[PDB]
Amino acid sequence: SKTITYYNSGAVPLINASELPYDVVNLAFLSSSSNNPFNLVLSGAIAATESSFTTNTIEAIKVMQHKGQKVLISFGGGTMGSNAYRSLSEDTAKLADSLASFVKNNQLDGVDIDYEDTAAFTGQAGYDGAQFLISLTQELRKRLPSPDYIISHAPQPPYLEQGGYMAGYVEVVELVGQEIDWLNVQFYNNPPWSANPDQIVSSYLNYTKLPNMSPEKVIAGFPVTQNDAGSGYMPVQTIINEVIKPIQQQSSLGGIMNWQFSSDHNGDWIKAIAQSL
C-alpha cells in the first residue's frame, strides 16, 4: 500500500515529509491562468512566483527523492474554472507538452490530475470531460512513460459510480485505466460517502473492480483534520478500524491519501495510518 499527501499550505516545512512514512507527495497546485488557459501558473506555498518553486521547495524535493519518495505536481484543484478546461479540451497535446515540460524541467516524478469539473460529465460544460481526461492521459503518458513517471488522478466518488449521472471516470478508466498509475479518491466533500465508513468501504471495493482497476490502483483519501474539508472528517481510529481494516479483510488496500500535509502535527496522523497499513 502507498501513503500519499497533498502539499498546499506551507504551515509545516516541506522537507519534514522526507522523514515521514510517505511514498508520494503531490505539490498543489499548477493550474490555468485566468488570462490564457494554456499558460499554467503555480499557487500555494511551493511558489516563489507564478512560474517558479521557492528555494526551500527545490531542495526539499531533492531530499525527498533521495529518500526514494516520489514528488508530483498536481494540476487542477478545486478553484480551476470549467471555462479554462473547455479551452484546454480543444488542444490536449499542447497542454500535455506544457505539463510534461514542467515535470522534466523541475525534475519531478510525474503529474497528479486533480480534476473537479463535475459539470463536464453532465453535459452542462460545453465539452466532453471524459474524452478530455482520456486524451490528456494518453498525450501525457506518451511524454512521461511508465515506469519512470507517475500519472495519477484524484476523482470524487460520484465520478466512479457505475451507471451514475456524473460517472465520467468510469469511461476514463475503461478507455485509459491501463495508463494511469492510481486514483486518489476523495472520500470527503461528498455525501453520502463523507464520514460514512460503510459506504466508503463498499464503494472502494466496487471501484477496485472497474475495468483496468484494482486495489493497487485505488487510494482512499481523507482529510487530516476537521478544517481540511467541508464534510467527511473522521478520527484516525475510525479510519483504521471502520475503513482500513474492513477493506483489508476482504481485499487489499492500494493506500491512503490525505488532504493535507501541513495539517498533520508532528506527522502523528501519517505515522498511525502507516502503521495500520
Author numbering: 2 to 278
Give verbatim lines from the article.
In this study, we characterized a thermostable endochitinase (Chi23) that can hydrolyze both crystalline and colloidal chitin. Chi23, from a marine bacterium Pseudoalteromonas aurantia DSM6057, is a member of the subfamily B of the GH18 family. However, different from other modular endochitinases of the subfamily B, Chi23 is a single-domain enzyme containing only a catalytic domain. The catalytic domains (CaD) of GH18 chitinases adopt the classical (β/α)8 TIM-barrel fold with a conserved catalytic DxDxE motif.
The crystal of Chi23 belongs to the P121 space group with four molecules loosely packed per asymmetric unit. Gel filtration analysis showed that Chi23 presents as monomers in solution. Consistent with sequence analysis, structural analysis also showed that Chi23 is a single-domain protein containing only a CaD, which is distinct from other endochitinases of the GH18 subfamily B that are all modular proteins. Chi23 comprises 14 α-helices and 10 β-sheets. The catalytic 113DxDxE117 motif is located in the loop between β6 and α5, and a hydrogen bond is formed between the catalytic residues Asp115 and Glu117. For Chi23, it only has such an α-helix, and lacks the β-sheets for the formation of a β-hairpin subdomain. Therefore, different from other bacterial chitinases from the GH18 subfamily B, Chi23 does not have a β-hairpin subdomain. However, similar to PPL2, Chi23 only has extremely short loops in these corresponding regions. Moreover, surface residues Phe30-Ser44 in Chi23 form two antiparallel β-sheets, which are conserved in nearly all eukaryotic chitinases of the GH18 subfamily B, but not in the bacterial chitinases of this subfamily where only one or no corresponding β-sheet is formed. A detailed structural analysis of Chi23 showed that the side chain of Asp229 forms four hydrogen bonds with the solvent-exposed residues Thr226 and Ser264, and that the side chain of Gln261 is hydrogen bonded to residues Ser10 and Asn9 lining on the substrate cleft surface.
